[PDB]
Amino acid sequence: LKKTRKAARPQKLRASLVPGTVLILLAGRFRGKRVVYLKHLEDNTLLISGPFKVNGVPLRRVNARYVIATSTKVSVEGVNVEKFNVEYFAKEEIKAERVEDQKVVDKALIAEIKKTPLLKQYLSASFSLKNGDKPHMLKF
Amino acid sequence: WRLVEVGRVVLIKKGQSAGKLAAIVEIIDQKKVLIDGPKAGVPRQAINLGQVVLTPLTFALPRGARTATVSKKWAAAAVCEKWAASSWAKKIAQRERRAALTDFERFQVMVLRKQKRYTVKKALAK
């Protein structure tokens, strides 16, 4: 095999994705649910939180291309997401750490969510389309 | 019955000036007229009646008035304030705002709509 000259350039994320932004998932068991972006992982996935205590969505890895960006942002500076890593999702039934870490993460974000009025209930409600909707026109 | 005349204010339907207000300065022929709108920034140019819709408002304008005179008369007549009070301008602004609503804004709108509907239904019958 010849020496292919293709360097692993780091991923470039679209400007519409910023930490603390409200994300919407279009695929998966949580499709249609509203989630909060936290950190970008080395595997090109997005670390997000429901938070779990609000809508039941735990910390999960998601792909940007399947996520619709929104202008609504919330503070995420107080959450120490450095603990999470790609190795934190390997498996080779819920693990004990998955509960305590999720609770700790949600404790530092439930207050911020409650700071903005109607944001808790807004996240608790699953997003869905309606008759006559025109996503291209809508800003989301 | 709206009639085309000098000083008649009109709304442009299509083009780079679409959505802006202009006034008829001089009629060229049955299908083409000369319009201007210094306040809206639309340059003085001729336009066909098919590309413009006449508004019910009207103000006095000298025939063949230049850009400065047209702007002065438009400012003096204050036709902009009358236009905003018209139901058509209100509907245009409402449509623009509704199209500009965000998803969270739409959810808040739905919550407020439910709150209003509860009271409205309670007010009936009684």
Place this chain on the structure above:
Amino acid sequence: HFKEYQVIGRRLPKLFRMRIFASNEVIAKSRYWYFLQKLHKVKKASGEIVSINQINEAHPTKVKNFGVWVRYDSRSGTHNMYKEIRDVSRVAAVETLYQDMAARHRARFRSIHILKVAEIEKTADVKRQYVKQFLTKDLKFPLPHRVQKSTKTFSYKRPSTFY
């Protein structure tokens, strides 16, 4: 969308000069060469186009009752015709005349000769009623049976044509 150009020639002198209306300088040069044969006996290889320059309207912001003399080659010879057109610029006035000729006499750019165009600054000088009617004092008239381009395939309100 026509354009006005001034083209001169001298067969390599008298410096014959005329005004040519064409969509581009290339067509203007060809029309000038064609008109040279009609005006006098000259060929393309005889000389060269001394100068060609586009002429822009002095002020495309004033309505002018252009008086135009046009000669066209009908199916049975060529006849001299004169008309008056109300417009804002010569470029638009000549285009309107061309469209009118093509609609009625079916004469087109191939068989239409533009002689002279001049504005009329005094009323009662235009002898054509279709232009004379627009020279009166500020008038008003409606636009009955107006229509709207309904993008949606279906309508529920039964649209009205009122203006």
Place this chain on the structure above:
Amino acid sequence: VEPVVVIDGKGHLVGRLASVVAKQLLNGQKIVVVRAEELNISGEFFRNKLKYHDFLRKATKTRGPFHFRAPSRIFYKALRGMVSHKTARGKAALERLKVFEGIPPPYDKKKRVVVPQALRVLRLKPGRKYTTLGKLSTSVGWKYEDVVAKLEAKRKVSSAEYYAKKRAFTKKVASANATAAESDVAKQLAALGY
């Protein structure tokens, strides 16, 4: 889009209406036509009548041409020539079409629709002659026009009372909204577009 669309033939043009209905049918949209007896065709009565009578005698010989009298069937024939009939796709498309004189139930209690680009008044130049189709059907052999009008007259009645009741209900709703105005929820909705 509604599962089924009802089109009011009143003041419409046979040609454009048939073309648009056929195009929608080919796309897989169900459409129904009502008040077909009031449909209109461009041109004076004599021209349209002659164009139809000549058709009745053009021969294939009864296997081909049929002296079909119903105006709804005439409209279907007009739309029939605009569809790829005699094939599975075209025949299946025609299955989603129904034409009835007047407005029989249960279509009466449902919102009918009109085609803006197929309006006879909108597209036909004012002052020019036009044909009402009903007279043509009556002259060519149709005899149910009198009964159609008689039982359509009852359609306007009762429906008028329903409209009056709906008008009263909307008056009450408008009054409730007017007294509901100036509320905090209403003010917030107005600020947020709605």
Place this chain on the structure above:
Amino acid sequence: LPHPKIVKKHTKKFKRHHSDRYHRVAENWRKQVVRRRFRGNISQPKIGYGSNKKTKFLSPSGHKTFLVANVKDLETLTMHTKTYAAEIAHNISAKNRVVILARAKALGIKVTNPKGRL
């Protein structure tokens, strides 16, 4: 591995023109509107359908099929086991088939048609 997508170009095997209508006509391709390659007619085999050299004669498993009928023939593939697979002829008795299969398995040569008469 060196088994890239093998594009057959034309999977449908050609059939003699009008062979279906008449029984006497065999399906073996034979030249003669077909000669004029009219629209809506069967295509004529031509140089355009040539398979790539690097993948010609290769089975979907990415190995060449080599007929074998003796121990020496199977052993000859010991050097070319990576590319050539063994194939037992239909005339080989079941008695020698066991020995051939055992030798192929011991030398790593794959058998295209195992279980024959077993």
Place this chain on the structure above:
Amino acid sequence: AESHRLYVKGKHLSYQRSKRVNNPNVSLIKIEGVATPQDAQFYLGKRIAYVYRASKEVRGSKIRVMWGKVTRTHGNSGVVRATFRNNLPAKTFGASVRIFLYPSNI
């Protein structure tokens, strides 16, 4: 919420074709609401899914789905060309289709 829809609905018209020649490798898909190619530009690259039911129970379920993609716009009415790994059967002419919102960029 009563409505769980997350994909823009549409219709299937016919494959790319001429007066007498049709290539099923390209399918013309109409998207509800779209009117001009400019609006359809947003839907480019979106996966198109067709859902149909069969009596036999396939390995995973009773539902079978085809996974396609959008290629480019078509016509002045906003029609968009759609390509599938397996071309849709001709019987589905005029049938509805599902256009998902991913992959997205907004």
Place this chain on the structure above:
RNA sequence: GGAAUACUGCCAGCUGGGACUGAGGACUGCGACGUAAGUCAAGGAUGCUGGCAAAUGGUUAUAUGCCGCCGUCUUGAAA
């Protein structure tokens, strides 16, 4: 007196959305980055991830979108 702007042409200007293509096979060649090691979009794709014991797909029947009896004959290609 002054700019602006429509139009034309240039950018070895910038920034995206979408479609097909991955073809070559250990390094030798022309170039950019760098004070040097070394790096690079620089004579053809790499890195990661998920579903799988019928997987992908083949022949065939039937229905859908479009297309459509043979050799010799006069020889104007023809019935």
Place this chain on the structure above:
RNA sequence: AAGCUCGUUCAGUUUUAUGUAAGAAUGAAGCUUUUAGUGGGCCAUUUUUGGGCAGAACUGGCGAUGCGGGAUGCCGAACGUAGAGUUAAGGUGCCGGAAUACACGCUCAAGACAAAAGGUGUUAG
């Protein structure tokens, strides 16, 4: 096809000489010798013949010719098997894949050999 030997010699290519010494442009060879087949008319054109018609001196095209368009029999384009994008002819109300697109007027019955003549039919100099 068959030997030589010159790599250059050639051209259905284009103006001044008066048809050319062309150190004018553009493109890129010769003598042989024997070896299968080859004896048609025609569409359009040319020379432009006379009184309907009949031969005719000529220049482009088939015979051996697919494909798109014209419902079907001149225009485009001349052909390996495939993926991707733009077009020719011809089209964008449906059958039929494409804008019931914009702009200037026309027309009441048409519209996709009769023009010799008339209309108090309609619109212009």
Place this chain on the structure above:
RNA sequence: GCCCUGGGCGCUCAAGCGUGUUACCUAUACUCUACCGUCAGGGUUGAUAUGCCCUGACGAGUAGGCAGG
């Protein structure tokens, strides 16, 4: 200028006519790339061969001729 006497459905401010301006429909035509073959040029053995290769162009066709199975 048009009318009167002299492909199917339908169309009538055309979906008729002439013309001007943009967009779109798609041939085996054109542009980029994957593969077979022919034709042309070249590397090749102090062994890597009627072989292993690199580069370009070309691909209609009856009788007829040649070549390969």
Place this chain on the structure above:
RNA sequence: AGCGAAACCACAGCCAAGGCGGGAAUCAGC
């Protein structure tokens, strides 16, 4: 209620016109 062929057989056919071409089964007329 017998005893069992021959002729013929690519395959066609219900007509509107031009490129010379808009339905079970048998009994009664030519």
Place this chain on the structure above:
RNA sequence: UUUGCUCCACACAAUAUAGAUGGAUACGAAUAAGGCGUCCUUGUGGCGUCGCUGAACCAUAGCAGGCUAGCAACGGUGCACUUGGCGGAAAGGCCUUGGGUGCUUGCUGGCGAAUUGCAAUGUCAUUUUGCGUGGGGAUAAAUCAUUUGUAUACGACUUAGA
């Protein structure tokens, strides 16, 4: 035909969709005018005003939508009943009185969501048919035969009979 036939309740399968994935979301009449609210000296009347698109209206928040606590009203609404009216064009639907029973996101809280591992429509509609029980309802008709003679080429047709 071991409820055989039929209409229902529950109950397991096959069968497929010309192709749901919130709502066909009801006047008439004119298009060189019609509504809406009001006035009434009631009219083709006066007054304020709406169009120029549905780019809207009704709804839409909960494990695809659960449990439970508190506040304000007895309004909104899913569903089993009941008094009564309207709809005969293809009426087969529209409702209306009264309570009963869930929810109510109108407002404020406590509970579980994870593992489908970064997605694989991630299965929720009925069209028809087949088999297993219980709640009722009724228990007939035609052909041949026999024959008729208005009919009758032969069919066919028209009859009488437990």
